[PDB]
From a paper:
Recent studies identified two synergistic enzymes from Flavonifractor plautii, namely, N-acetylgalactosamine deacetylase (FpGalNAcDeAc) and galactosaminidase (FpGalNase), which efficiently convert A-type RBCs to O-type by removing A antigens. In this study, we investigated two enzymes from Flavonifractor plautii, N-acetylgalactosamine deacetylase (FpGalNAcDeAc) and galactosaminidase (FpGalNase), which demonstrate synergistic activity in efficiently converting A-type RBCs to O-type. O-type RBCs lack immunodominant sugars found in A (α-N-acetylgalactosamine) and B antigen (galactose), making them essential in emergencies and when matching blood types is not feasible. One promising solution is the enzymatic conversion of all red blood cell (RBC) types into universal O-type RBCs.
We successfully determined the cryo-electron microscopy (cryo-EM) structure of full-length FpGalNase at 2.56 Å resolution. The N-terminal region (residue 27–699) adopts a disc-like conformation divided into three segments: the N-domain, the central GH36 domain, and the C-domain. Structural similarity analysis using the Dali tool revealed that each domain exhibits a structure similar to α-galactosidase, despite low sequence identity. Conserved residues in FpGalNase active site include W317, D346, D347, W387, K461, and D463 (patch A), along with specific non-conserved residues (Y464, C513, and D532) in patch B, which afford a more open catalytic center conformation and may determine its substrate specificity. Site-directed mutagenesis of D463A, Y464A, C513A, and D532A confirmed the functional importance of these residues, as mutations led to significant reductions in conversion activity, with D463A, C513A, and D532A nearly inactive, and the mutants were unable to convert A-type RBCs to O-type in samples from healthy donors. Moreover, comparison between the experimental structure and the AlphaFold-predicted structure revealed a significant deviation in the region from D559 to W564 in the catalytic pocket, highlighting the critical role of experimental data in refining structural models. Sequencing analysis of FpGalNAcDeAc and FpGalNase revealed three mutations in each protein, including V284A in FpGalNAcDeAc and P566L in FpGalNase, located within their catalytic domains. The resolved structures of FpGalNase revealed unique active centers.
Numbering used by the authors: 44 to 701
């Protein structure tokens, strides 16, 4: 009982009721998971472990969700509860290493109450001393939980992490665990948001990844579908798993922006207005335009403090005493100096003391007790800055968002918007809205994002749209309507670099991604291929450094290059590495300041991805020095010592150097 579509091989054992996963390399296969159970519901606080195999049927040539492939069905029966389980696994020929899972439950005797459903449990095989994991998250601590974590296998303790997707958690519903040989990625398969758990558990000698959904009462004689999930068995690191997941979900209607439709203003260097904090004035920004124009900045954004209240989105009289005239003047100055203008924005907010709530209570979300609800911070808390949420199924909220977009784009003059400081939508209990379920409000933020982006596009084909789910991984269902992605206020440099790699995997090689500006890491911004942006009012030696690195970024242009991340593996390679291709010439970035993963000694450096039949000269462009020469593409090994970083490029040479 086995199927194998492309790059995978799933086998089922009738006697033990276990599933084993493989991955194809060369002409053979590599084991990637030890035998694992199928999974079942949680009845009475304990998972049912009385399921008995009935029959298994395998179909060799079927068409399914992702196209042509294979499918086999497993039917099991439980005597204690009377439930009947049907398990369906699907693979496709075109897609490499993706498995589709579907579950259905039927109650034949009497009512069965289920508190949680469990499927697709897989345990890693071949682990030796450590396992690196990717966590979709959504509920973790805001600014201090890395999206990539290490599971040490020599520790006394154990590592467990439950990545939730609920009313207080909105992020990518994907988790991945990998070792040097490869890894396994499990993620949701749904075109719209729902409730899904992606736990990562450390076992006695390995780690586990799983999928889970909430349950409800199953009536007698009724068939209910629980959920669906995607399993990715890949070689390498989380980049391959995320890329496979994106390719798989491209078949469910979730399609990311194409490289030929991203506006050219997305790649331009940007300067935030955080230099003076909340005490900024129009005159200061106007007077700071000449220096940035000389340096090479081609984008200016307006941050917090310009509005009176959220929802109303009226101009603050303190910052704009003359009204729309001042905004037009600032926009005209920015345009005259050859730059575009953006605006700060909190999409789903509606305020607490705003006129929108004072005059129109009926567009907001109602709690269980009959009171307005507030936007939740990750975990379930409340921040004073955040206000009441706006129900997506009320026409007033959509009308207000469109009105604000049109007013900003046609009256004041602005070429884009910056979404910030919002995470999730609470449940609504208002009977007037006629909600089918209280969760209907939580599953429809994509409607607000889509409507706002449609208005923006209708006003101008080339627009800037970025959302900051600051602290946590960004909402997956807001991705199709963006043009740039940030790293959501990373705390350390390793965080922003790893998140840049992950978002390149999810989005695409050419998608604009920035490395944020919380701390000065120009090296990591340039080396990873991100967009260099700044917030401060710099003067002196740091000002000279800022201009120098702006010039380097302008003369290299790695933000418009192609990102390659499948060659090397993170956590099982001598250095933390990132590869960018620009006009044929390959660029490399090696790092050592990644406190999470830094090596001892000075290991040799191997450049892979080069033509074997070509001779290359390796020259650093930061200092204009030839580190190595006469290096054939096959060997491509040279020994060098550096403190923190090493940025190099492979310049082709027709004849050997002297």
């Amino acid at each position: 009982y086995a199927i194998a579509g492309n790059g995978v091989r799933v086998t089922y054992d009738a006697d033990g009721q276990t599933i084993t996963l493989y991955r194809t390399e060369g002409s053979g296969l590599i084991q990637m998971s030890k035998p694992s159970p199928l999974g079942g519901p949680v009845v009475g606080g304990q998972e049912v472990q009385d399921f008995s195999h009935i029959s298994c049927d395998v179909e060799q040539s079927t068409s399914g969700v992702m196209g042509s492939g294979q499918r086999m069905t497993i039917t099991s029966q439980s005597m204690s509860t009377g439930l009947i389980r049907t398990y369906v696994l699907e693979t496709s020929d075109i897609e490499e290493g993706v498995v589709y899972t579907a579950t259905s439950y039927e109650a034949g005797a009497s009512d069965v109450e289920v508190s949680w459903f469990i499927g697709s449990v897989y345990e890693l095989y071949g682990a030796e001393d450590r396992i690196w994991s990717y966590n979709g998250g959504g509920e973790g601590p805001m600014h201090y939980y890395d999206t990539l974590q290490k599971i040490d296998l020599t520790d006394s303790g154990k590592f467990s992490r439950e990545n939730k997707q609920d009313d207080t958690a909105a992020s990518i519903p994907v988790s991945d665990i990998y070792i040097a040989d490869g890894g396994i990625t499990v993620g949701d398969a749904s075109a719209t948001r729902r409730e899904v758990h992606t736990p990562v558990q450390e076992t006695s000698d390995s780690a586990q990844v799983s999928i889970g959904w909430p349950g409800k009462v199953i009536a007698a004689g009724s068939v209910i579908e629980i959920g669906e999930s995607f399993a990715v068995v890949h070689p390498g690191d989380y980049y391959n798993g995320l890329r496979g997941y994106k390719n798989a979900m491209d078949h469910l209607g979730v399609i990311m922006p194409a490289p030929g439709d991203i506006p050219d203003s997305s790649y331009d260097l940007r300067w935030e207005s955080w230099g003076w904090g909340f005490n900024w004035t129009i005159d200061l920004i106007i007077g700071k335009l000449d220096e940035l124009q000389a340096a090479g900045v081609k984008q200016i954004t307006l941050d917090d403090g310009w509005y009176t209240n959220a929802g109303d989105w009226a101009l603050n009289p303190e910052k704009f005493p003359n009204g729309a005239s001042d905004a037009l003047r600032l926009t005209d100055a920015i345009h005259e100096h050859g730059m575009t203008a953006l605006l700060w924005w909190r999409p789903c907010d509606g305020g607490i003391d705003s006129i929108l709530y004072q005059q129109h209570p009926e567009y907001f979300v109602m709690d269980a007790d009959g009171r307005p609800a507030r936007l939740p911070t990750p975990g379930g808390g409340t921040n004073p800055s955040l206000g009441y949420a706006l129900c997506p199924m009320a026409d007033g909220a959509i009308a207000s968002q469109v009105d604000f977009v049109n007013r900003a784009m046609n009256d004041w003059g602005f070429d884009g918007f910056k979404g910030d400081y919002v995470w999730s939508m609470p449940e609504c209990y208002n009977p007037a809205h006629n909600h089918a379920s209280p969760e209907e409000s939580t599953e429809k933020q994509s409607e607000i994002y889509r409507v706002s982006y449609e208005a923006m596009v209708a006003n101008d084909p080339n627009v800037f749209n970025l959302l900051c789910n600051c602290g946590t991984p960004q909402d997956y269902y807001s991705l199709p309507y963006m043009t740039q992605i940030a790293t959501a206020d990373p705390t350390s440099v390793d965080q922003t670099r790893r998140r840049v790699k992950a978002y390149k995997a999810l989005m695409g090689d050419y998608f604009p991604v920035t490395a944020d500006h919380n701390n000065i890491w120009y090296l990591s911004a340039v080396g990873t291929g991100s967009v260099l942006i700044e917030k401060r009012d710099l003067s002196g030696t740091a000002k000279e450094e800022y201009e120098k690195w702006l010039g380097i970024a302008d003369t290299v242009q790695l933000q418009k290059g192609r990102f390659i991340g499948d060659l090397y593996s993170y956590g099982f390679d001598p250095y933390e590495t990132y590869v960018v291709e620009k006009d044929g010439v390959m660029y490399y970035a090696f790092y050592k300041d990644g406190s999470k993963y830094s090596p001892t000694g000075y290991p040799d450096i191997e450049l892979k991805g080069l033509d074997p039949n070509k001779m290359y000269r390796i020259v650093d462009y930061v200092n204009d020095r030839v580190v190595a020469t006469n290096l054939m593409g096959d060997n491509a090994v040279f020994n060098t010592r550096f403190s923190d970083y090493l940025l190099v490029k492979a310049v082709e040479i027709s004849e050997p150097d002297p």
